[PDB]
Design a protein around this ligand. Structure first.
Ligand SMILES: CN[C@@H]1[C@H](O)[C@H](NC)[C@H]2O[C@@]3(O)C(=O)C[C@@H](C)O[C@H]3O[C@@H]2[C@H]1O
Ligand SMILES: [K+]
Ligand SMILES: [K+]
Ligand SMILES: [K+]
Ligand SMILES: [K+]
Ligand SMILES: [K+]
Ligand SMILES: [K+]
Ligand SMILES: [K+]
Ligand SMILES: [Mg+2]
Ligand SMILES: [Mg+2]
Ligand SMILES: [Mg+2]
Ligand SMILES: [Mg+2]
Ligand SMILES: [Mg+2]
Ligand SMILES: [Mg+2]
Ligand SMILES: [Mg+2]
Ligand SMILES: [Mg+2]
Ligand SMILES: [Mg+2]
Ligand SMILES: [Mg+2]
Lengths: 131, 87, 200, 80, 134, 163
RNA sequence: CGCGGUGCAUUAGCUAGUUGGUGAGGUAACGGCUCACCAAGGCCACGAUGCAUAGCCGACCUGAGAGGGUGAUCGGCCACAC
RNA sequence: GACGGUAUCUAACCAGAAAGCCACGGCUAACUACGUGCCAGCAGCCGCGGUAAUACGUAGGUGGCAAGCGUUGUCCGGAUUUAUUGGGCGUAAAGCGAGCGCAGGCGGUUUCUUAAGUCUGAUGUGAAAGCCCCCGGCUCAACCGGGGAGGGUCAUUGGAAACU
C-alpha cells in the first residue's frame, strides 16, 4: 500500500515533468500543501490551486517551463523516508547544488527551505531535495 | 598528604616544570589533582607563572609545598599572604 | 645529503636552465647519455608531472623528503594558490635569499656560504640553508667573511635583482621587502603540475 | 538535594512477593544504519504491598540495593 | 537490502588470508602448540634439496629446497640466483613470495643469510642474492 | 551547436586502440583513435576515427571531435556544482574544488577537463574505465552543469535570491 | 546504577542461594554477603547459557569522509608477581 | 654539578679522511651493447628465455631515492570488492516452487493534546600529553613550552513543535 504520500507527490511531479504535462493533481495534505507553496515561491512551479472535495481535498499543481519548454525542475529526491528518517542539525543543513537547488526541511518553526533554516539557525527533518 | 610540587617536563637536558597539586603517592610525572603554575629554571632569572588564588586556596586546605615550590611561592609573595590569612 | 654531481646534465634532463643563464642548454639541448641526441617516445603525463616537480627541487637543491614536507606546510596556508604559496616558501629559504640578494652567483655557492656560516640573520649567525626567512629580516655576511673574493665577485657581477628584494652593496645586507609574486619567480615552472604530482 | 533516576514502565511479573518486574521500552538509533530500534530494559522494583498488578504502568525511582537484583522502588501506579 | 534487513543482518566482509601462511605461525615447545606470530622470515632446515619442473608454458629445472621450519611446518621453498651451496640438513632463512612457475612453492630462501651463500659472480642487484660489494 | 571556426582548438589523443576484423584470409587490423578537442576556454569536444594507420585515424577523430563541441559552464577555475555523468558503464563524479587544488581526475577525464579549461576540480570514476565511455560519461556530466544566471532566469529570480 | 566498545546458534535453553520474602548474623557499608525458615521464581531469539579470543582507555596508523586496523613507548584505570 | 671540561665559543690547518642501494618490456620515471639460446635464469601481475631477448647475466649509459636503499612480513588505501554515506538480483553471482500467517518492520485524512524521537539555548563534565589552531623557545627542524579549539548518539535544566 502507499506508505509515503510525500514521495508519491514528488514522484507525480517528476513523472509529469518528464513528459512536460501542463498540470498535475494529487490528494491533499498539509505537508503536501506546504511543499507546493515552497515550490511556488521559489520559482519551480507556475501556480497551485486547492480543491475542496468530500474525501481529503485535491491540490492542483501547474508545472513551469521556460523558453523552448526548458524544464525549470530538473529532478526531485525524497531524503527522509519511512524506512529511514533523516534529521540534520542547524549546522548540518544541506546545500543542494551549491545553492542552485533547495532542500525542504520540516522544523519546529514550520516547513521551510534550507536557506531559511540556516538563517534561523535551526535543523529538522529533511523532506526533499529540489533542483 | 596533598603536595604542591613540581612535575618534570621538557626534553632531556632541558627541564621544564609544571607546579601541580598532587597526592604524595602519585608518580612524579603521573596522576595529579590540578595544575597551579609553571617553573622554568633555564632562565637566568627563573620564570614563574602562578595561579595565586588556586595556590592560596590549596594551602589553606593543608597542601604541603615541596622544598623548591616553597621558595617559588615566597618570591611571588604567596607564602606571605598565607601567613596573613592564618593571622 | 647534497647533490654534488655535474650541474649541466641536470638542466638538460629538465629542459630548462637551472642557473637561468642558458649556458647549460646552449650545446646539446637534449637529455644526457648516449640516447640523448636521437628521438625517443612521448613522455607520459606522469613523466610530465615528475619533471615539473623535479624542476623545482633541483632548482633549490633540496632532497625529496624536505621538499615533500615543505609542500605539505604550503598547503596549510589557507589563502592563495597552493602551488604559488609553495613557490614563495622555497624562495624564503635562506639559501635562496642569499642567492637572490646577490651574495652568490649560484645557489650551490649560496648554500656553501650559508652552511659554512658566513651569513648572519638579523645580526645573528645562522648556518641552516633550510632556514625560513620572514619578510624584513636582514641577511648579511659575517664581519670576518665580508672580504672574500667569492662574495665580492658575486656582489659586483650580479647587475639585476628581483623587485621583492632590498639590498645594500656596502653593508652587504639585504632583505625581501615582500613576498614574491608568481610572475616574479620562474614562469616556465608550472606549479599546477607539481600540485597534481603530489596529489597522486 | 541530588536526584536519582526515575523511569516509566510496565509491570510484566508480580509472581514474587513485595517485588515487580518493570519494562521501560526506549528506542535507540542503530550505530551504522541510523534507524531507530526498539529496546527493552527491565528492572526489579520493591513493591511495598504487592499493589501494582501485571500489565500496569508504574513509575519507579532508584534506591540502594534492596536484594540481589532489586535497585528500584515503586513510586506511582499511573494506569491499571 | 532494505534498511531493516541490514539492521537485522548487517553487512559482513570477506576475510582475507595470507599468501605465506607458514610465516604467520610460531611454535611453543612447552605447550607444544602453534602460536599466531607474524614473522617477516623464518629459519628452517633443508630436508630435501633438488630441482623441479615448471608449469606448461615454461620449461626449466627450478631449484627448490624442502624445508621444515622452526615452527614444525613443512614448506617448499625456492633458491633464487644462479648456483647455490645448499644441501640436506642445512639451516636456511625463508622469506615470503610465490614462484608462479612452481605450483607448490610459496617461499624463497634468503641468500647470504644463515648457511645460504651469496650468489657467485653477482654484480647487479647484489643486495638481493646477498653478495658483498666487490 | 558550437561552431568550430573562430576557436583555436587544441587536440589530445586520449586512446589509440588496435582493433581486428576477422577475415577469410586472416585478420584486418585497424586503429581506432579517441581524441578530445578543446579551446581551453570552456569549449570541449571528443571524436572517434578509424584507419589502417595511426596518423590517418587521429585526423578523422579530430575532424569528428570539432563537429561535436559543447560548452562547459565554469565558475572561475572550477565548475558551478557537483554532477554525476553516466553513460553505459562509465560513471564519473565531478565536484567543484578550491582554487589552486588542481585537476584531481584520472584517466581520460583529465583530457576532457584540461582541454575544456577547468583547472581545479575533484572527480572520481565510479564505473567502468573503458576510455570511450568515461569520456562520454564526462560530457554527460558537463552537459548537466547549470549557470546561476540561467537558473535564476528560469525561476524568475535574481541570482541573489537563488543564493 | 544508565549507556558504550569482540567472534560462533553447524552454541537455546540456562539457573536451585538459584529469584523473592521473613528474621537472624556479618561488613566501613547496602545486599543471599551468609544462614535457618516460607514461597517459587529469575534469565533468554532485544541472543540467556556455552565456546573461542582479548587487559580497557586517552590515543596511534590509514582514509575525502563514513569507516577500517592497532592498543609499543607516554598518562589514567584494572589485574597479576613461581 | 652525576652529566663534565658536556654543550657552546674562538683560533690555526687541509679537500684533504666522509655513498650507496634499487630500478630502467608494459603498468612505471629511466636503453643500448655484448654473453647465453625454453638452457642458465627472471617474475608483483601480464609474461620473458626455443642461436639478432631494451624482460635472463655483465658493461656503459639512464631514472628514482640518498646515509640510506631494497626485500620480506603486517595494517589502511586504491576495493562502490558487504555499497549507511555508496552496489545489485529477466539472460553475468543473486527472487524461496507457492500460499496462510505469529512476532517484527512500515503504514491514509484531520482537530486538540502530549513531547518520547527531532531541533535549539544555558550550565556541568568529556584529566594531562597527543593531532589541529594561534603564540613563543631551542642557530633551523625534529623537539619543547604557553594559550586555545575539537571531541559525547553525556547528564541537568529552559525553550520550539512542522515531522515520527
Ligand atoms: C574462388 N576464388 C576465391 C574467392 O574469390 C574469394 N572471395 C570470395 C577470394 O577471397 C580472397 O580474396 C580473400 O579475401 C582471402 C583469401 C584467403 O582468399 C582470397 O582469394 C579468394 C579467391 O581465391
Ligand atoms: K534475606
Ligand atoms: K591481558
Ligand atoms: K594468581
Ligand atoms: K622488468
Ligand atoms: K545502499
Ligand atoms: K517465483
Ligand atoms: K518532542
Ligand atoms: Mg638560575
Ligand atoms: Mg637525513
Ligand atoms: Mg632485476
Ligand atoms: Mg558515433
Ligand atoms: Mg574509501
Ligand atoms: Mg617509460
Ligand atoms: Mg635486464
Ligand atoms: Mg570499502
Ligand atoms: Mg546460466
Ligand atoms: Mg543467473
Amino acid at each position: 500500500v502507499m506508505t509515503d504520500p510525500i514521495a508519491d507527490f514528488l514522484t507525480r511531479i517528476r513523472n509529469a515533468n518528464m513528459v512536460k504535462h501542463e498540470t498535475l493533481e494529487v490528494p491533499a495534505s498539509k505537508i503536501k500543501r506546504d511543499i507546493a507553496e515552497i515550490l511556488k515561491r521559489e520559482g519551480f512551479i507556475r501556480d497551485v490551486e486547492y480543491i475542496e472535495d468530500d474525501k481529503q481535498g485535491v491540490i492542483r499543481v501547474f508545472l513551469k517551463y521556460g523558453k523552448n519548454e526548458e524544464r525549470v525542475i530538473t529532478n526531485l529526491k525524497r531524503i527522509s523516508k519511512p524506512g529511514l528518517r533523516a534529521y540534520v542539525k542547524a549546522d548540518e543543513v544541506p546545500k543542494v547544488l551549491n545553492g542552485l537547488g533547495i532542500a525542504i526541511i520540516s522544523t519546529s518553526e514550520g516547513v521551510i527551505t534550507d536557506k531559511e533554516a540556516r538563517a534561523k539557525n535551526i535543523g529538522g527533518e529533511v523532506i526533499a531535495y529540489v533542483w | 598528604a596533598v603536595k604542591i610540587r613540581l612535575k618534570r617536563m621538557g626534553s632531556k637536558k632541558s627541564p621544564f616544570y609544571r607546579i601541580v597539586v598532587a597526592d604524595s603517592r602519585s608518580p612524579r610525572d603521573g596522576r595529579f589533582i590540578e595544575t597551579v603554575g609553571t617553573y622554568n629554571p633555564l632562565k637566568d632569572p627563573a620564570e614563574v607563572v602562578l595561579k595565586e588564588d588556586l595556590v592560596l586556596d590549596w594551602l589553606s586546605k593543608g597542601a604541603q609545598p615541596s622544598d623548591t615550590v616553597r621558595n617559588i611561592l615566597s618570591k611571588e609573595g604567596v607564602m606571605k599572604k598565607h601567613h596573613e590569612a592564618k593571622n | 645529503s647534497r647533490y654534488t654531481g655535474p650541474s649541466w646534465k641536470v638542466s638538460r634532463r629538465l629542459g630548462i636552465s637551472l642557473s637561468g643563464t642558458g649556458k647549460e642548454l646552449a650545446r646539446r639541448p637534449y637529455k644526457p647519455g648516449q640516447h640523448g641526441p636521437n628521438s625517443r617516445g612521448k613522455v607520459s603525463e606522469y613523466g610530465m608531472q615528475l619533471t615539473e616537480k623535479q624542476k623545482l627541487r633541483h632548482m633549490y637543491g633540496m632532497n625529496e623528503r624536505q621538499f615533500r614536507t615543505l609542500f605539505i606546510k604550503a598547503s596549510k596556508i589557507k589563502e592563495g594558490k597552493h602551488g604559488v604559496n609553495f613557490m614563495v616558501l622555497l624562495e624564503q629559504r635562506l639559501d635562496n635569499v642569499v642567492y637572490r640578494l646577490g651574495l652568490a652567483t649560484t645557489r650551490r655557492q649560496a648554500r656553501q656560504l650559508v652552511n659554512h656560516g658566513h651569513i648572519t640573520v638579523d645580526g645573528k649567525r645562522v648556518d641552516i640553508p633550510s632556514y625560513h626567512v620572514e619578510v624584513g629580516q636582514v641577511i648579511g655576511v659575517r664581519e670576518k667573511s665580508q672580504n672574500i673574493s667569492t662574495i665580492k665577485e658575486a656582489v659586483e657581477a650580479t647587475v639585476g635583482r628581483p623587485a621583492f628584494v632590498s639590498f645594500d652593496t656596502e653593508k652587504l645586507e639585504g632583505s625581501f621587502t615582500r613576498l614574491p609574486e608568481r610572475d616574479e619567480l620562474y614562469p616556465e615552472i608550472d606549479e599546477a603540475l607539481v600540485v597534481e604530482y603530489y596529489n597522486q | 538535594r541530588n536526584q536519582r533516576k526515575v523511569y516509566q514502565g510496565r509491570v510484566v511479573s508480580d509472581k514474587m512477593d513485595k517485588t515487580i518486574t518493570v519494562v521501560v521500552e526506549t528506542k535507540k538509533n542503530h550505530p551504522i544504519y541510523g534507524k531507530r530500534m526498539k529496546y527493552s530494559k527491565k528492572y526489579k522494583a520493591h513493591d511495598e504491598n504487592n499493589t501494582a498488578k501485571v500489565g500496569d504502568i508504574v513509575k519507579i525511582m532508584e534506591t540502594r540495593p534492596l536484594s540481589a537484583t532489586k535497585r528500584f522502588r515503586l513510586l506511582e501506579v499511573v494506569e491499571e | 537490502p532494505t534498511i531493516n534487513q541490514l539492521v537485522r543482518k548487517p553487512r559482513k566482509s570477506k576475510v582475507e588470508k595470507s599468501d605465506s601462511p607458514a610465516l604467520n605461525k610460531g611454535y611453543n615447545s612447552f605447550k607444544k602448540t602453534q602460536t599466531n606470530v607474524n614473522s617477516p622470515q623464518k629459519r628452517g632446515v633443508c630436508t630435501r634439496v633438488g630441482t623441479m619442473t615448471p608449469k606448461k608454458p615454461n620449461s626449466a629445472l627450478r631449484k627448490y629446497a624442502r624445508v621444515r621450519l622452526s615452527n614444525l611446518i613443512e614448506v617448499t621453498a625456492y633458491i633464487p640466483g644462479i648456483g647455490h651451496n645448499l644441501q640436506e640438513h642445512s639451516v636456511v632463512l625463508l622469506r615470503g613470495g610465490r614462484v608462479k612457475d612452481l605450483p607448490g612453492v610459496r617461499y624463497h630462501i634468503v641468500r647470504g643469510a644463515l648457511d645460504t651463500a651469496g650468489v657467485n659472480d653477482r654484480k647487479q642487484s647484489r643486495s638481493k642474492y646477498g653478495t658483498k660489494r666487490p | 551547436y558550437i561552431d568550430p571556426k573562430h576557436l583555436e582548438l587544441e587536440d589530445r589523443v586520449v586512446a589509440i586502440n588496435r582493433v581486428t576484423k576477422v577475415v577469410k584470409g586472416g585478420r584486418r587490423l585497424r586503429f581506432a583513435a579517441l581524441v578530445v578537442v578543446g579551446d581551453k576556454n570552456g569549449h570541449v569536444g571528443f571524436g572517434t576515427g578509424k584507419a589502417q594507420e595511426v596518423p590517418e585515424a587521429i585526423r578523422k577523430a579530430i575532424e569528428d571531435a570539432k563537429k561535436n563541441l559543447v560548452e562547459v559552464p565554469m565558475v572561475g577555475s572550477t565548475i558551478p556544482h557537483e554532477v554525476i555523468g553516466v553513460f553505459g558503464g562509465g560513471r564519473i563524479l565531478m565536484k567543484p574544488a578550491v582554487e589552486g587544488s588542481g585537476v584531481a581526475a584520472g584517466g581520460p577525464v583529465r583530457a576532457v577537463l584540461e582541454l575544456a579549461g577547468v583547472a581545479d576540480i575533484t572527480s572520481k570514476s565510479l564505473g567502468s574505465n573503458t576510455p570511450i565511455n568515461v569520456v562520454r560519461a564526462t560530457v554527460e556530466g558537463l552537459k548537466q552543469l547549470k549557470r546561476a544566471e540561467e537558473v535564476a532566469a528560469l525561476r524568475g529570480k535574481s541570482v541573489e535570491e537563488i543564493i
